[PDB]
């Protein structure tokens, strides 16, 4: 009853900051996990030759691109913050803007982390295969490019979602 009515009220600025920051944090965590998987794969096959190391470097470049996308998203969210006066931080329009920003951050960061984990696993398998067969390198690069394209798609989604806020 009373608790149900109370639960509605929330502070939009906290949600906006969470959307600005947690997405970048999760993207960084996913990129780190992918980089760790790639590094383990490279350590496994470092015996033979550094072509697998070059493939892992391409994967790390994809991870760094994901990180740069997260940094750009954070910068945009810093810019995308609405007027949101300290006094006027209770309007329902501010709540709608906060919800939109949180949705943008959730869609961005989670997809970025999933793409990073996928890229890490694919790069590990690709490094193993390249260590196995010398000929198969372009096929590995194809999967790496696919992971990078997934990260870029997430970045583009964040860029589109940048224009969401409606707070006063």
């Amino acid at each position: 009853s009373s608790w149900s009515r109370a639960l509605v009220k929330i502070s939009p600025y906290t949600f906006s900051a969470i959307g600005i920051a947690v997405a970048i944090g999760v993207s960084v965590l996913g990129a780190a996990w992918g980089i760790y998987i790639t590094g383990s794969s490279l350590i496994g096959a470092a015996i033979k030759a550094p072509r697998i190391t070059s493939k892992n470097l391409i994967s790390v470049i994809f991870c760094e691109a994901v990180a740069i996308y997260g940094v750009i998203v954070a910068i945009i969210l810093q810019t995308k913050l609405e007027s949101v006066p300290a006094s006027q931080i209770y309007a329902p329009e501010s709540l709608r803007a906060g919800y939109a920003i949180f949705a943008s951050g959730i869609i961005v960061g989670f997809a970025n982390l999933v793409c990073g984990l996928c890229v890490g696993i694919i790069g590990s398998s690709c490094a193993l295969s390249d260590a196995q067969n010398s000929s198969l390198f372009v096929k590995i690069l194809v999967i790496e490019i696919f992971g990078s394209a997934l990260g870029l798609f997430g970045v583009i989604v964040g860029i589109i979602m940048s224009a969401q806020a409606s707070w006063p």
Partner: protein
């Protein structure tokens, strides 16, 4: 806002479905590595499904972009019923999409094993992958119905 959060979740659920299908794409690529360890032609054949799976996620991102274009809440006021309907339908679509992505990953692993072996029922493996992609497309289409199901 509660209606804003409901519609946002309605879209982000299909977004998360695509993100989950990215895991099936990763499994397909992992299998494709072993498949191409045998023959580079099999490597290309197995790699193509990974590119298709990534294109599926790109399409999900495009759908999210369309949702962001339509995200403006001034045009339509959503009540408790509307927000609940949107969120529930989106979540159902997202669950269906994640399940389809998992099935697609399993089928991709099986097809990678087949390509590592001789061609054999490569057509059948492609048919199974097509069935998984058709389930994913059915979920994506069902999402549009709920997206358009708004207003008085």
């Amino acid at each position: 806002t509660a209606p804003f959060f409901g519609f946002l979740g309605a879209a982000a659920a299909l977004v998360f479905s695509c993100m989950g299908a990215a895991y099936g794409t990763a499994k397909s690529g992992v299998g494709v590595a072993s498949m191409g360890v045998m023959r580079p032609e099999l490597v290309m054949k197995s790699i193509v499904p990974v590119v298709m799976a990534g294109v599926l996620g790109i399409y999900g991102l495009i759908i999210a972009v369309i949702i962001s274009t339509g995200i403006n809440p001034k045009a339509k006021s959503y009540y408790l019923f509307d927000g609940y309907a949107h969120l529930s339908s989106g979540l159902a679509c997202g669950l269906a999409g994640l399940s389809a992505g998992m099935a697609i990953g399993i089928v991709g692993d099986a097809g990678v094993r087949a390509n590592a072996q001789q061609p054999k029922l490569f057509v059948g493996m492609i048919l199974i992958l097509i069935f998984a992609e058709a389930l994913a497309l059915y979920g994506l289409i069902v999402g549009i119905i709920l997206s358009s199901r708004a207003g008085q």
